[PDB]
RNA sequence: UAGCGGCGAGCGAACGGGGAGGAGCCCAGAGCCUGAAUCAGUGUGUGUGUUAGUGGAAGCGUCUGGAAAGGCGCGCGAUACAGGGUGACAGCCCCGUACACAAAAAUGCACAUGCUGUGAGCUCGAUGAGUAGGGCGGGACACGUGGUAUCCUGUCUGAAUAUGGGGGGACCAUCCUCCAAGGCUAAAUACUCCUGACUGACCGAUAGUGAACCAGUACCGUGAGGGAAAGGCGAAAAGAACCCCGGCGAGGGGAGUGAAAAAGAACCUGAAACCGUGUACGUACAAGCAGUGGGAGCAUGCUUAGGCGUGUGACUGCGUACCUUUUGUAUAAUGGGUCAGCGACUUAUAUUCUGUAGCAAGGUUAACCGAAUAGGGGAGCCGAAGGGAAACCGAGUCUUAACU
């Protein structure tokens, strides 16, 4: 029983070249080059789910550190102030509040000033 | 049951190792035979009893003995397979027809392997001391 | 033990032939083996030796900026080779007498539970004509059948040769695959008696 | 084709009841006068093959 | 297995048993009596076969379609539902098939049998000399000169010749067994250039023969020799009359044929690499495996009175390809121009182990006989007992004078 493999291979190559859609030059056209791009893309994607959680924390922390210093307190002292008052609110929201509702935010900086 | 509905017992069939079919296969690229050297090579591996050029065990040890021609043509008749012949007579030609000992066996011996019931007169045949007690305890007289 | 459909006579058949537990593995092995026995296995590709062409190196070992070749016939080249060329082979596999008998005893007893086995008295067509056989199966309410008979009538044989779904084996020539394949099995009282003695 | 026994091995080993192999000891052919009697006595009876070099023996004689 | 063997690698019997098939004669010659039973004429003359052949059953109506064998509904032949064709898949349209039948003729055969021609029976025996054997040297025997029988001989020699001689694995002696030195013999057995039929868990145009095709051709080589590539319009050529542009060209546009002409002969399908034309977005102060997380804008698709898809991706954090081989590779170490196709742990028999199924102190058959995957055939094999170099003894036995 001979097995021609033209139907199955095509379906394998065409699947990867579909993931490589958008890439420059051979990386979108040429299986042998695309297949590398698609693995590398996977590797970077896998690592960047880890880095996304880091980047955003830095982003929020910067926002909070900015919005705190407008009210006369540094980030380091503010967070200790909040921890010592048993405030459980995270960076993600403090950063959201910092941008949107500053009149509210100010109350957290006062709440921190108590400690 | 239909021709389709039949299936084997679980554990009966086990696929088979297929070497050189990608990473996911486990074995794949060097089909479980490592990197380089004589054993990796097609038609590779040394012959039997080869110890890297050290004198082999089957040559450093001395030869002994000689093959007896008499031992080839003598049987050890089991006493359990004794009353399976012709009532209670077991010469040699009678025992040979029962397919207990080979055709080219002149000398033969009844040993104590356990279990006799019927009386058997064992003629023209060498008999063991334990079997002599058994055969006579069952009933039959030797020679 | 087995009632008929035009008599109601108590044919006392043996218990450990027609009343056993269905051992699926055994049956599967015997039927697979039976199938494997049907193969003729007549095929051949030709190895790099058997291909036509010279042993000459097309180009020399070194010097030309090309991949070292030793033969036109090498299986990595086009139009020559097939690495592990098939040789005509025998796929028939051994089945132990007791396993074959055990499988028949297993399958033939499951026909009694499923009611595919229609035991009958004298079963024979009048003259060698399919029209009659086909017409008499309408009353019996059958279509895809294995008509097992002890005394193999030529009249009955000839009259089922053209009928596709009907097959007329002799009681001696029952098979594992056949008994399973056909949707009903019609055995003659003599044939049951012969099969009883054959399987034992 | 059937496997061939390594005959030389078949002439130096013998299969015991359990599965192990008995063999004669080395150092008892020549140069005996310098050897102590105690050695020559201990080398006289047959000896079982070691578990390390059992696999080498089992392969080279596959019938008995 | 026994043996052989730098006793290494390896080589490897026989006796005996089960089967297939069976079959024997003639010469080295003298009585009575006679051509007779045997081979072979040649015949003819039957039976067959082979090389031409003949008949050979029974379907219609609607629906879809270019076309019906299709679907739907009712019939009918079947010793014919093998298979093939026919405008899509046909038991019943056609060719076949089962089956029944054929030969003027030339042949393969199968026995009556007239017979140019050839000795049945019968007894007296004869009963194969440069031979057997030997020395020397080689070879064949499973057996490598070994303690080597047996066989063959190049060379040199040499019996006895049935009161005799050969073999029984150095050799001898007793027993047993055969009768060399001359011939001829069917079957079982091996093979397939070739002729048919039939079959494939064989291939389906880079496969299968090298060769589906005007292939051992083209082409290459002084020559021996090497040796390609290259299949498919459509149901039917109905192969595009006639116009128009062009050089009364190529090539096109119409028109027509067809169900369809991006089925128009560079002709089923028509992928990918590769090269284009048009639409959306981005892109001419910006440094690197070109992506990836983040993300504005713009363009489209939608439900809308929120936004969510899709394409693009300004700006920005991180980020030196894959394979190989290595202590270690972004490595400036190897391999890859790209795509498509093909391209590497197989098969047979033995063997040990694991799983699984059968049956169990038993298990189990081989060739073969069966037309037959049934079922016979247990010849065997393996197991149920081992110890010892071996005789031998044996739930023991070896060691040893004997063993705590
Ligand atoms: Mg296959
Ligand atoms: Mg195929
Ligand atoms: Mg593709
Ligand atoms: Mg792939
Ligand atoms: Mg594509
Ligand atoms: Mg994209
Ligand atoms: Mg994009
Ligand atoms: Mg592409
Ligand atoms: Mg593309
Ligand atoms: Mg594309
Ligand atoms: Mg976090
Ligand atoms: Mg399964
Ligand atoms: Mg499983
Ligand atoms: Mg497993
Ligand atoms: Mg396999
Ligand atoms: Mg693995
Ligand atoms: Mg691994
Ligand atoms: Mg391994
Ligand atoms: Mg390697
Ligand atoms: Mg190495
Ligand atoms: Mg290695
Ligand atoms: Mg090789
Ligand atoms: Mg090698
Ligand atoms: Mg050395
Ligand atoms: Mg020795
Ligand atoms: Mg020795
Ligand atoms: Mg036997
Ligand atoms: Mg070869
Ligand atoms: Mg050559
Ligand atoms: Mg050459
Ligand atoms: Mg180069
Ligand atoms: Mg190249
Ligand atoms: Mg070719
Ligand atoms: Mg080929
Ligand atoms: Mg191939
Ligand atoms: Mg291959
Ligand atoms: Mg097999
Ligand atoms: Mg197999
Ligand atoms: Mg059988
Ligand atoms: Mg069916
Ligand atoms: Mg000594
Ligand atoms: Mg010392
Ligand atoms: Mg000492
Ligand atoms: Mg010592
Ligand atoms: Mg064995
Ligand atoms: Mg054996
Ligand atoms: Mg010898
Ligand atoms: Mg030597
Ligand atoms: Mg040596
Ligand atoms: Mg040889
Ligand atoms: Mg040989
Ligand atoms: Mg050989
Ligand atoms: Mg033999
Ligand atoms: Mg023999
Ligand atoms: Mg005999
Ligand atoms: Mg016979
Ligand atoms: Mg004759
Ligand atoms: Mg004569
Ligand atoms: Mg004469
Ligand atoms: Mg004639
Ligand atoms: Mg004639
Ligand atoms: Mg005829
Ligand atoms: Mg004809
Ligand atoms: Mg006709
Ligand atoms: Mg007809
Ligand atoms: Mg219509
Ligand atoms: Mg219409
Ligand atoms: Mg249709
Ligand atoms: Mg439908
Ligand atoms: Mg119909
Ligand atoms: Mg209907
Ligand atoms: Mg109807
Ligand atoms: Mg009908
Ligand atoms: Mg059919
Ligand atoms: Mg047919
Ligand atoms: Mg037919
Ligand atoms: Mg057709
Ligand atoms: Mg069509
Ligand atoms: Mg067709
Ligand atoms: Mg119809
Ligand atoms: Mg029909
Ligand atoms: Mg019609
Ligand atoms: Mg025919
Ligand atoms: Mg007939
Ligand atoms: Mg005729
Ligand atoms: Mg005529
Ligand atoms: Mg004539
Ligand atoms: Mg004639
Ligand atoms: Mg002829
Ligand atoms: Mg003579
Ligand atoms: Mg003579
Ligand atoms: Mg003469
Ligand atoms: Mg002599
Ligand atoms: Mg001579
Ligand atoms: Mg001589
Ligand atoms: Mg001599
Ligand atoms: Mg001389
Ligand atoms: Mg000499
Ligand atoms: Mg010599
Ligand atoms: Mg030698
Ligand atoms: Mg030789
Ligand atoms: Mg020699
Ligand atoms: Mg000598
Ligand atoms: Mg020797
Ligand atoms: Mg020697
Ligand atoms: Mg002699
Ligand atoms: Mg002889
Ligand atoms: Mg004389
Ligand atoms: Mg004389
Ligand atoms: Mg003699
Ligand atoms: Mg002689
Ligand atoms: Mg003699
Ligand atoms: Mg002798
Ligand atoms: Mg001999
Ligand atoms: Mg005597
Ligand atoms: Mg005699
Ligand atoms: Mg005589
Ligand atoms: Mg001679
Ligand atoms: Mg002769
Ligand atoms: Mg002849
Ligand atoms: Mg004859
Ligand atoms: Mg033939
Ligand atoms: Mg042929
Ligand atoms: Mg095929
Ligand atoms: Mg080709
Ligand atoms: Mg094609
Ligand atoms: Mg092509
Ligand atoms: Mg070629
Ligand atoms: Mg030329
Ligand atoms: Mg051509
Ligand atoms: Mg074409
Ligand atoms: Mg035209
Ligand atoms: Mg013009
Ligand atoms: Mg012109
Ligand atoms: Mg013009
Ligand atoms: Mg012109
Ligand atoms: Mg013109
Ligand atoms: Mg023109
Ligand atoms: Mg024109
Ligand atoms: Mg034209
Ligand atoms: Mg045109
Ligand atoms: Mg046109
Ligand atoms: Mg047109
Ligand atoms: Mg038209
Ligand atoms: Mg039209
Ligand atoms: Mg139309
Ligand atoms: Mg079309
Ligand atoms: Mg179309
Ligand atoms: Mg159209
Ligand atoms: Mg049209
Ligand atoms: Mg058109
Ligand atoms: Mg057009
Ligand atoms: Mg058009
Ligand atoms: Mg089209
Ligand atoms: Mg066109
Ligand atoms: Mg179209
Ligand atoms: Mg078309
Ligand atoms: Mg063309
Ligand atoms: Mg084209
Ligand atoms: Mg085209
Ligand atoms: Mg076509
Ligand atoms: Mg077509
Ligand atoms: Mg086309
Ligand atoms: Mg396209
Ligand atoms: Mg394309
Ligand atoms: Mg491109
Ligand atoms: Mg391009
Ligand atoms: Mg722009
Ligand atoms: Mg733009
Ligand atoms: Mg700009
Ligand atoms: Mg600047
Ligand atoms: Mg710019
Ligand atoms: Mg740059
Ligand atoms: Mg950089
Ligand atoms: Mg990107
Ligand atoms: Mg992205
Ligand atoms: Mg993203
Ligand atoms: Mg946006
Ligand atoms: Mg917009
Ligand atoms: Mg992006
Ligand atoms: Mg800008
Ligand atoms: Mg960035
Ligand atoms: Mg970087
Ligand atoms: Mg790196
Ligand atoms: Mg590499
Ligand atoms: Mg290297
Ligand atoms: Mg290095
Ligand atoms: Mg690195
Ligand atoms: Mg590199
Ligand atoms: Mg570079
Ligand atoms: Mg290097
Ligand atoms: Mg380099
Ligand atoms: Mg390398
Ligand atoms: Mg290197
Ligand atoms: Mg390169
Ligand atoms: Mg392969
Ligand atoms: Mg392997
Ligand atoms: Mg296989
Ligand atoms: Mg065999
Ligand atoms: Mg085996
Ligand atoms: Mg095991
Ligand atoms: Mg196991
Ligand atoms: Mg199990
Ligand atoms: Mg089991
Ligand atoms: Mg059981
Ligand atoms: Mg049991
Ligand atoms: Mg049991
Ligand atoms: Mg027991
Ligand atoms: Mg048994
Ligand atoms: Mg059995
Ligand atoms: Mg026969
Ligand atoms: Mg036969
Ligand atoms: Mg018979
Ligand atoms: Mg028969
Ligand atoms: Mg039969
Ligand atoms: Mg028997
Ligand atoms: Mg049996
Ligand atoms: Mg023993
Ligand atoms: Mg022992
Ligand atoms: Mg003793
Ligand atoms: Mg002793
Ligand atoms: Mg003792
Ligand atoms: Mg004592
Ligand atoms: Mg004692």
Swiss-Prot record, chain A:
<dbReference type="GO" id="GO:0000027">
    <property type="term" value="P:ribosomal large subunit assembly"/>
</dbReference>
<dbReference type="InterPro" id="IPR005813">
    <property type="entry name" value="Ribosomal_bL20"/>
</dbReference>
<dbReference type="GO" id="GO:0070180">
    <property type="term" value="F:large ribosomal subunit rRNA binding"/>
</dbReference>
<dbReference type="GO" id="GO:0022625">
    <property type="term" value="C:cytosolic large ribosomal subunit"/>
</dbReference>
<dbReference type="GO" id="GO:0005737">
    <property type="term" value="C:cytoplasm"/>
</dbReference>
<comment type="similarity">
    <text>Belongs to the bacterial ribosomal protein bL20 family.</text>
</comment>
<dbReference type="GO" id="GO:0005829">
    <property type="term" value="C:cytosol"/>
</dbReference>
<comment type="function">
    <text>One of the primary rRNA binding proteins, it binds close to the 5'-end of the 23S rRNA. It is important during the early stages of 50S assembly.</text>
</comment>
<dbReference type="Pfam" id="PF00453">
    <property type="entry name" value="Ribosomal_L20"/>
</dbReference>
<dbReference type="GO" id="GO:0003729">
    <property type="term" value="F:mRNA binding"/>
</dbReference>
<dbReference type="GO" id="GO:0003735">
    <property type="term" value="F:structural constituent of ribosome"/>
</dbReference>
<keyword id="KW-0699">rRNA-binding</keyword>
UniProtKB/Swiss-Prot annotation, chain B:
<keyword id="KW-0689">Ribosomal protein</keyword>
<dbReference type="InterPro" id="IPR021131">
    <property type="entry name" value="Ribosomal_uL15/eL18"/>
</dbReference>
<dbReference type="GO" id="GO:0019843">
    <property type="term" value="F:rRNA binding"/>
</dbReference>
<keyword id="KW-0694">RNA-binding</keyword>
<dbReference type="GO" id="GO:0002181">
    <property type="term" value="P:cytoplasmic translation"/>
</dbReference>
<dbReference type="GO" id="GO:0003735">
    <property type="term" value="F:structural constituent of ribosome"/>
</dbReference>
<feature type="region of interest" description="Disordered">
    <location>
        <begin position="1"/>
        <end position="54"/>
    </location>
</feature>
<dbReference type="InterPro" id="IPR001196">
    <property type="entry name" value="Ribosomal_uL15_CS"/>
</dbReference>
<protein>
    <recommendedName>
        <fullName>Large ribosomal subunit protein uL15</fullName>
    </recommendedName>
</protein>
<dbReference type="Pfam" id="PF00828">
    <property type="entry name" value="Ribosomal_L27A"/>
</dbReference>
<dbReference type="InterPro" id="IPR036227">
    <property type="entry name" value="Ribosomal_uL15/eL18_sf"/>
</dbReference>
<feature type="compositionally biased region" description="Gly residues">
    <location>
        <begin position="21"/>
        <end position="31"/>
    </location>
</feature>
Curated annotation (Swiss-Prot), chain C:
<dbReference type="GO" id="GO:0015934">
    <property type="term" value="C:large ribosomal subunit"/>
</dbReference>
<dbReference type="GO" id="GO:0003677">
    <property type="term" value="F:DNA binding"/>
</dbReference>
<keyword id="KW-0046">Antibiotic resistance</keyword>
<comment type="subunit">
    <text>Part of the 50S ribosomal subunit. In TnaC-stalled ribosomes forms part of the binding pocket for L-Trp with the leader peptide and uL22.</text>
</comment>
<keyword id="KW-0678">Repressor</keyword>
<keyword id="KW-0804">Transcription</keyword>
<dbReference type="GO" id="GO:0001070">
    <property type="term" value="F:RNA-binding transcription regulator activity"/>
</dbReference>
<keyword id="KW-0699">rRNA-binding</keyword>
<feature type="region of interest" description="Disordered">
    <location>
        <begin position="43"/>
        <end position="70"/>
    </location>
</feature>
<dbReference type="InterPro" id="IPR002136">
    <property type="entry name" value="Ribosomal_uL4"/>
</dbReference>
<keyword id="KW-0805">Transcription regulation</keyword>
<comment type="function">
    <text>Protein uL4 is a both a transcriptional repressor and a translational repressor protein; these two functions are independent of each other. It regulates transcription of the S10 operon (to which uL4 belongs) by causing premature termination of transcription within the S10 leader; termination absolutely requires the NusA protein. uL4 controls the translation of the S10 operon by binding to its mRNA. The regions of uL4 that control regulation (residues 131-210) are different from those required for ribosome assembly (residues 89-103).</text>
</comment>
From Swiss-Prot, chain D:
<dbReference type="GO" id="GO:0022625">
    <property type="term" value="C:cytosolic large ribosomal subunit"/>
</dbReference>
<dbReference type="GO" id="GO:0002181">
    <property type="term" value="P:cytoplasmic translation"/>
</dbReference>
<dbReference type="GO" id="GO:0003735">
    <property type="term" value="F:structural constituent of ribosome"/>
</dbReference>
<keyword id="KW-0687">Ribonucleoprotein</keyword>
<feature type="compositionally biased region" description="Basic residues">
    <location>
        <begin position="9"/>
        <end position="21"/>
    </location>
</feature>
<dbReference type="InterPro" id="IPR021137">
    <property type="entry name" value="Ribosomal_bL35-like"/>
</dbReference>
<keyword id="KW-0689">Ribosomal protein</keyword>
<comment type="similarity">
    <text>Belongs to the bacterial ribosomal protein bL35 family.</text>
</comment>
<dbReference type="GO" id="GO:0005737">
    <property type="term" value="C:cytoplasm"/>
</dbReference>
<comment type="subunit">
    <text>Part of the 50S ribosomal subunit.</text>
</comment>
<dbReference type="InterPro" id="IPR018265">
    <property type="entry name" value="Ribosomal_bL35_CS"/>
</dbReference>
<dbReference type="Pfam" id="PF01632">
    <property type="entry name" value="Ribosomal_L35p"/>
</dbReference>
